[PDB]
A = this chain, B = another copy of it.
Amino acid sequence: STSQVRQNYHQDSEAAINRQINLELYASYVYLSMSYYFDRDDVALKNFAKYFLHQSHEEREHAEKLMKLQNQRGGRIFLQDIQKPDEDDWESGLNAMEAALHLEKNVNQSLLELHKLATDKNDPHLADFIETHYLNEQVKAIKELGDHVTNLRKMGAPESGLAEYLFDKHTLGD
């Protein structure tokens, strides 16, 4: 019993996709936790909460789109525990943005290794899938998060509660 659709689909890549699914679900969990941190009455930054809730839902499509690809190529989904975030309390708008930047770089590095695995096993379809749906999305998220961390720092965060409040209204509100 091997899948009728399987073709040029190496098993290391199949396993790498299964790990990537867990990573994207994890990322979505991190964002879910950040968003409702900023919903706390003693944090109370509504657009920070909306911004991170949006990222969390985005990561959930990233996970589902990878699950879709596995079935398309004949792989078999095997899910694992979605490890809890490293933090329940994110201290500040700035820290959350700095933490988010770190998370997206780790997902990016696992995606770049997935692409190297695909090219090494000469699977051009999986590589093009990775280029089209993830690599440029990661570069845009990292840059945007970089832009955000720069601005919060120059406004005087995190020491300046006035800085985070104004960033919340003028950049994250739209």
Closest 5 CB pairs of A and B: A154-B161, A82-B82, A44-B147, A41-B146, A128-B131
Contacts of A136 in B (CB 8 A): 125, 128-129
Q: Is the CB of B80 within 8 A of A5?
A: no
* Chain A count of residues within 8 A CB distance of the other chain: 86
With A83-B81, A124-B115, A124-B131 as given contacts, are A153 and B161 in contact (CB-CB < 8 Å)? yes
Copies in the complex: 5
Q: Given B105, B162, B167, which contacts A154 in the complex, CB threshold below 8 Å? A: B162
> In this assembly, does A163 line the interface, its C-beta being within 8 Å of a C-beta of chain B?
yes
Report A128 CB to chain B, min CB distance, Å.
Answer: 4
| A161: contacting residue among B5, B33, B156, CB under 8 A | B156
**With the chains together, A156 CA to B164 CA distance in Å?**
12
